[PDB]
Amino acid sequence: QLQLQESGPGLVKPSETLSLTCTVSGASIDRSTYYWGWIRQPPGKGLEWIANIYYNGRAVYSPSLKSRVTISVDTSKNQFSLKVRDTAVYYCATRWNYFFDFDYWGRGTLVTV
Amino acid sequence: LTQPPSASGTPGQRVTISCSGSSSNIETNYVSWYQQFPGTAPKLLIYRNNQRPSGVPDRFSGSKSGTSASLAISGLRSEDEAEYYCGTWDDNSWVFGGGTKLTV
Amino acid sequence: LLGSNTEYVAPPMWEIHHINSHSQCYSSYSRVIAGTVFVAYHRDSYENKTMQLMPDDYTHSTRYVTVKDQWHSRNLTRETSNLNCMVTITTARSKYPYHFFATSTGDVVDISPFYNGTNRNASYFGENADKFFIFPNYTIVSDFGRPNSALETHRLVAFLERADSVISWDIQDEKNVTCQLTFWEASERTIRSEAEDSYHFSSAKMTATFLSKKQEVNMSDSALDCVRDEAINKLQQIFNTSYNQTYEKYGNVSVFETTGGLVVFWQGIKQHLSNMESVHNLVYAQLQFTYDTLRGYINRALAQIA
Amino acid sequence: HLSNMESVHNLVYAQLQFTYDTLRGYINRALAQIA
Amino acid sequence: LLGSNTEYVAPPMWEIHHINSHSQCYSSYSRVIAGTVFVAYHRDSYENK
Ligand SMILES: *[C@@H]1O[C@H](CO)[C@@H](O[C@@H]2O[C@H](CO)[C@@H](O)[C@H](O)[C@H]2NC(C)=O)[C@H](O)[C@H]1NC(C)=O
Ligand SMILES: *[C@@H]1O[C@H](CO)[C@@H](O)[C@H](O)[C@H]1NC(C)=O
Ligand SMILES: *[C@@H]1O[C@H](CO)[C@@H](O)[C@H](O)[C@H]1NC(C)=O
Ligand SMILES: *[C@@H]1O[C@H](CO)[C@@H](O)[C@H](O)[C@H]1NC(C)=O
Ligand SMILES: *[C@@H]1O[C@H](CO)[C@@H](O)[C@H](O)[C@H]1NC(C)=O
Ligand SMILES: *[C@@H]1O[C@H](CO)[C@@H](O)[C@H](O)[C@H]1NC(C)=O
Ligand SMILES: *[C@@H]1O[C@H](CO)[C@@H](O)[C@H](O)[C@H]1NC(C)=O
Ligand SMILES: *[C@@H]1O[C@H](CO)[C@@H](O)[C@H](O)[C@H]1NC(C)=O
Ligand SMILES: *[C@@H]1O[C@H](CO)[C@@H](O)[C@H](O)[C@H]1NC(C)=O
């Protein structure tokens, strides 16, 4: 079955770079991929969409982040990451299904600026 | 996107929620709704408008026209207390609405 | 006479939709390679007219073509292009757990024939994500041969879109269409003698004896669902048209997986499922039957002697 | 008047019948001359 | 170096009869398609030997 966990730092000083990596126990990405993005939510607030990447280098960002974001993918170790140059709880959800939209979610730990 | 932060109903009332965006988004795409219990991650509740994933009963509903959608949770009960979010593809990416706490 | 390249090409998706909603193809192929787009026309200098499909001449396959001949004409070396749009229909098999199907024509698809757009968790998709599409209530021209033909609206249709072709199939319901067990036979009056580690279901009529582990299988195993109802109705069918009613049902219908991998439905009278396959030659059970019988009988005599 | 059937491949089914036939033939012989 | 079409073709029946009664073939294929007949020869400009 699909499976998404998350690791990474949990204390970031302002203006400094954050790295978040999401591991999948699918366990593969393939040309059979669809989308894998990031979703953040400030506790007590609503949900916010971050970035999104395919198994190709191409990716789609939200200009709300003014492209401060920059995501990476390593199919070798079956993971995709993210680089940022505002404090919230994070997530990695995907597309694993024609039709639908965003399905299959992975708890993404909390980080504070 | 736009959502009124709350809604209300007695156990057995056909409660509804609107979902307001522009013509860039909800007009020319597909709406998805999500029942996030607080302290967990969201479950897709309605996909590609009206359509219900396996598990979601007939009680929840879908509806779309113009640049605003809807979600009619008839036969409202207790366990339906959660956080419902709507959202689609704008011309470039994915967006969410505000959110809504259902209270019975 | 000079050369003859002939290459086999998938139509564009807009054309796929035309083909199977009108029973006709356009008399032009166009593909872009590098910068510019290239383009071929049927007879030379032709326009972009529509062309209806008609039946070929035959195997298990069923073909529909838009042109039944080849053509050319006579100062310098000239190269005519013969354009043919052809819809062919092949049977494809696929066996449990249906993670891929294949046609007799060498196409192999790593998608479940029951990957209803929703159920990738309970199914499989493993071809190019780029190229695969699914369309709920989708119209189809129902017979490409005739051009008047009525229209069907298929529940769910997939399209795979490979390099030499576009592949389409009607998505069905697994479990509705596939059952993984088949009625072999029924034994009225079977005898369930118990043993050390195993029950022995000795049937005289089918000349054989079957041994099962002592723990019967949960009747609510999903594996049994497709024959569950038949098996009971097969059972009750007997106790109804077999013996009189001095006999009466002892214990509930219980199911056993036998060594060798049959599955046995038991219903007594008076007065958690191995992925294994079924064993092919049933002598192993006629053998057990032989031993069981002679040994049973020998002990009987020698006892009443001693 | 001749089944279009094929020949069966493993002939144990006939050695099996042979076994039963022999022991049963022999058992009945003894037990008779005993009784 | 450029292309290389190669097509595999049945002889005409008169030639079949020649082949198997003389152990030899004619150095020319001819097939009619649409209107005119087309024709190939072994080495270029050869005759019908
Ligand atoms: C897609 O497939 C799933 C099966 O994985 C379907 O779920 C079935 O339908 C309902 C669930 O709401 C149950 O009554 C069945 O027992 C389910 N079967 C299984 C095997 O889970 C689902 O309905 C299908 N959806 C579509 C649109 O075809
Ligand atoms: C032929 O017509 C179709 C639709 O009418 C069009 O999409 C296609 O590009 C045309 N091909 C040409 C003009 O070569
Ligand atoms: C995926 O399918 C399996 C098998 O039916 C099931 O046990 C599991 O709960 C499913 N997962 C989800 C998230 O629905
Ligand atoms: C047509 O499709 C819609 C949405 O997929 C579905 O609700 C409807 O039942 C379909 N029609 C039939 C006759 O099944
Ligand atoms: C599969 O189930 C559907 C839904 O009940 C039914 O309409 C259809 O006829 C079934 N298919 C077969 C082959 O029985
Ligand atoms: C068999 O399984 C069903 C559910 O799968 C359960 O309700 C029942 O109690 C089980 N019976 C047993 C474990 O004997
Ligand atoms: C089988 O039994 C049912 C009731 O148990 C009865 O209605 C039916 O007539 C019986 N079948 C036959 C062939 O007698
Ligand atoms: C048979 O089933 C009935 C109810 O379904 C139950 O009361 C009884 O104990 C069962 N007998 C068995 C499992 O031997
Ligand atoms: C070659 O000769 C045969 C018989 O001699 C003749 O039938 C055939 O047409 C000839 N081919 C040519 C002249 O191209």
Author numbering:
A (entry chain H): 1 to 85, 91 to 118
B (entry chain L): 4 to 107
C (entry chain A): 161 to 218, 221 to 236, 240 to 436, 469 to 503
D (entry chain A): 469 to 503
E (entry chain A): 161 to 209
Please, what does the article write about this entry?
Among them, glycoprotein B (gB) and the gH/gL heterodimer are conserved within the herpesvirus families (α, β and γ) forming the core fusion machinery essential for viral entry into cells. Membrane fusion is mediated by gB, which acts as the fusogen1112. Crystal structures of HSV and Epstein–Barr Virus (EBV) postfusion gB have shown a close similarity despite the relatively low sequence identity. These structures revealed that the gB ectodomain has an elongated three-lobed shape and is composed of five structural domains (I–V). Here we have reported the crystal structure of an engineered homogeneous postfusion HCMV gB ectodomain trimer bound to a Fab derived from the neutralizing human monoclonal antibody 1G2.
Subsequently, we deleted the first 63 N-terminal residues, shown to be flexible in HSV-1 gB11, from gB-698glyco resulting in the ΔNgB-glyco construct (residues 86–698). The deglycosylated ΔNgB-glyco/1G2 Fab complex crystallized readily without need for protease treatment. After screening several crystals, a 3.6-Å resolution dataset was obtained and the structure determined by the molecular replacement method. The resulting electron density maps allowed model building for gB and the Fv portion of the Fab. The overall domain organization of postfusion HCMV gB is similar to HSV and EBV gBs. Electron density was observed for glycosylation of 10 of the potential 16 sites in the ΔNgB-glyco crystal structure, with the remaining six sites occurring in disordered regions of the structure. 1G2 binds to a region of domain I (AD-5) encompassing a hydrophobic patch distinct from the fusion loops. Notably, 1G2 contacts gB mainly using heavy chain CDR1 and -3 (HCDR1 and -3), and establishes only limited interactions through the light chain CDR-2 (LCDR2). Over 1,350 Å2 of surface area is buried in the complex, which is well within the range of 1,200–2,000 Å2 observed for other antigen–antibody complexes. The aromatic side chains of HCDR3, Tyr103, Phe104 and Phe105 along with Asn102 and HCDR1's Tyr34 fill a hydrophobic cleft on the surface of gB consisting of residues Tyr280 and the stretch between Phe290 and Phe300.
